[PDB]
Every structure is written in C-alpha cells, then in structure tokens.
Design an enzyme around this catalytic site. Structure first.
Site, PDB file in Angstrom:
ATOM      1  N   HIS A 127       0.722  -1.276   0.000  1.00  0.00           N
ATOM      2  CA  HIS A 127       0.000   0.000   0.000  1.00  0.00           C
ATOM      3  C   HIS A 127       0.751   1.327   0.000  1.00  0.00           C
ATOM      4  O   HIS A 127       0.121   2.379  -0.097  1.00  0.00           O
ATOM      5  CB  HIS A 127      -0.997   0.004   1.167  1.00  0.00           C
ATOM      6  CG  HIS A 127      -1.863  -1.215   1.224  1.00  0.00           C
ATOM      7  ND1 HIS A 127      -2.914  -1.425   0.356  1.00  0.00           N
ATOM      8  CD2 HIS A 127      -1.811  -2.306   2.024  1.00  0.00           C
ATOM      9  CE1 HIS A 127      -3.469  -2.595   0.617  1.00  0.00           C
ATOM     10  NE2 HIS A 127      -2.817  -3.151   1.623  1.00  0.00           N
ATOM     11  N   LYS A 182      -4.870  -9.777  -7.938  1.00  0.00           N
ATOM     12  CA  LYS A 182      -5.493  -9.206  -6.742  1.00  0.00           C
ATOM     13  C   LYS A 182      -6.612  -8.286  -7.235  1.00  0.00           C
ATOM     14  O   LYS A 182      -6.355  -7.302  -7.920  1.00  0.00           O
ATOM     15  CB  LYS A 182      -4.463  -8.414  -5.929  1.00  0.00           C
ATOM     16  CG  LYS A 182      -4.932  -8.001  -4.539  1.00  0.00           C
ATOM     17  CD  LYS A 182      -3.803  -7.319  -3.771  1.00  0.00           C
ATOM     18  CE  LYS A 182      -4.152  -7.097  -2.304  1.00  0.00           C
ATOM     19  NZ  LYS A 182      -5.242  -6.105  -2.102  1.00  0.00           N
ATOM     20  N   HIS A 210      -2.602  -3.333   7.977  1.00  0.00           N
ATOM     21  CA  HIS A 210      -3.720  -3.674   7.097  1.00  0.00           C
ATOM     22  C   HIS A 210      -4.419  -2.415   6.610  1.00  0.00           C
ATOM     23  O   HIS A 210      -4.610  -1.482   7.380  1.00  0.00           O
ATOM     24  CB  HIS A 210      -4.716  -4.546   7.872  1.00  0.00           C
ATOM     25  CG  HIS A 210      -6.023  -4.761   7.174  1.00  0.00           C
ATOM     26  ND1 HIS A 210      -6.179  -5.664   6.145  1.00  0.00           N
ATOM     27  CD2 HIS A 210      -7.249  -4.224   7.390  1.00  0.00           C
ATOM     28  CE1 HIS A 210      -7.444  -5.677   5.758  1.00  0.00           C
ATOM     29  NE2 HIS A 210      -8.113  -4.811   6.499  1.00  0.00           N
ATOM     30  N   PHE A 211      -4.754  -2.373   5.322  1.00  0.00           N
ATOM     31  CA  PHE A 211      -5.479  -1.226   4.775  1.00  0.00           C
ATOM     32  C   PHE A 211      -6.944  -1.644   4.801  1.00  0.00           C
ATOM     33  O   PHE A 211      -7.336  -2.568   4.088  1.00  0.00           O
ATOM     34  CB  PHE A 211      -5.046  -0.920   3.344  1.00  0.00           C
ATOM     35  CG  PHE A 211      -5.563   0.394   2.832  1.00  0.00           C
ATOM     36  CD1 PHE A 211      -4.846   1.564   3.043  1.00  0.00           C
ATOM     37  CD2 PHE A 211      -6.789   0.467   2.175  1.00  0.00           C
ATOM     38  CE1 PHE A 211      -5.341   2.796   2.607  1.00  0.00           C
ATOM     39  CE2 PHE A 211      -7.293   1.695   1.736  1.00  0.00           C
ATOM     40  CZ  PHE A 211      -6.568   2.857   1.954  1.00  0.00           C
ATOM     41  N   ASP A 212      -7.753  -0.957   5.604  1.00  0.00           N
ATOM     42  CA  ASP A 212      -9.157  -1.330   5.745  1.00  0.00           C
ATOM     43  C   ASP A 212     -10.134  -0.638   4.804  1.00  0.00           C
ATOM     44  O   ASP A 212     -11.046  -1.280   4.279  1.00  0.00           O
ATOM     45  CB  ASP A 212      -9.605  -1.144   7.197  1.00  0.00           C
ATOM     46  CG  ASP A 212     -10.661  -2.157   7.623  1.00  0.00           C
ATOM     47  OD1 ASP A 212     -10.491  -3.365   7.347  1.00  0.00           O
ATOM     48  OD2 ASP A 212     -11.654  -1.744   8.257  1.00  0.00           O
TER      49      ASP A 212
END
Length: 124
Positions: free
Chosen positions: A12, A41, A119-121
């Site tokens: 990210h 992805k 983590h990219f939420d």
C-alpha cells in the site's frame, strides 16, 4: 519472512509519486509490488503520502475495523491515494487494472510495538 508491517508497505505505500501519474499506473504497480503473483489481486489501494504520515494514523481517530476488531484508525486529513480495480478483460497472468486517483481519508489497522499499520481497511 516478511513482517506484517513490511507487507503493508509493499502492498500500500508509494511515496514516490504525488498521485496517479498515468492510466497504466496500476498495471505496472500491481505487478511491481508482486500483487499479481498467485492471482490477479481484485482491488488494492496505494497511498501517496510519507511513511511517517501514514504511520501517524495509528495515533489518530480510533474506529471499528470492517471485521469487528477495534484496532482501526481513520486519518484526520484526506490523503492522496490511488485505487486499483481489476477489469473484465483482465485474465491471469495478464492482469488488467483501472487506475483511479482521489483525495480521501484512509482507515488502517495497527498492531505491534512499534504500533504501526498492518492492514489497509478502507478509504472514505
């Protein structure tokens, strides 16, 4: 043995560009960052801010994560991000993506000591 924090950076972080430079940005980046290795992805977001500014989000607005966990944080200010979305013509191993630049608040999950993004939420 790539750490969760390292994986977040690879998947990210892109402080090199100020925004989505070209229409082929996602096509190149998704491949460059190894996000098209085992499969295409589906969706991925890149953040064009300094690592320091992204890590700082872990001390910002605490919000609920999409999975119910409570270790997510929303940035107080909007950030330059690029969303990559797999097209219909996209067929592995030739993954095709739609590049879309925008200025939005980001939500990341943080863990560890140091407390950093893992983590990219979401983008809001």
């Amino acid at each position: 043995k790539e750490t969760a924090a390292a994986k977040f950076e690879r998947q990210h972080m892109d402080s090199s560009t100020s925004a989505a430079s070209s229409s082929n940005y996602c096509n190149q980046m998704m491949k460059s960052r190894n996000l098209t290795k085992d499969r295409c992805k589906p969706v991925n977001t890149f953040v064009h801010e300094s690592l320091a500014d992204v890590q700082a989000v872990c001390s910002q607005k605490n919000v609920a994560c999409k999975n119910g966990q409570t270790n997510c944080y929303q940035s107080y200010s909007t950030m330059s991000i690029t969303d990559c979305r797999e097209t219909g013509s996209s067929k592995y191993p030739n993954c095709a993506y739609k590049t879309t630049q925008a200025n939005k608040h980001i939500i990341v999950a943080c863990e560890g000591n140091p407390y950093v993004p893992v983590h990219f939420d979401a983008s809001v």
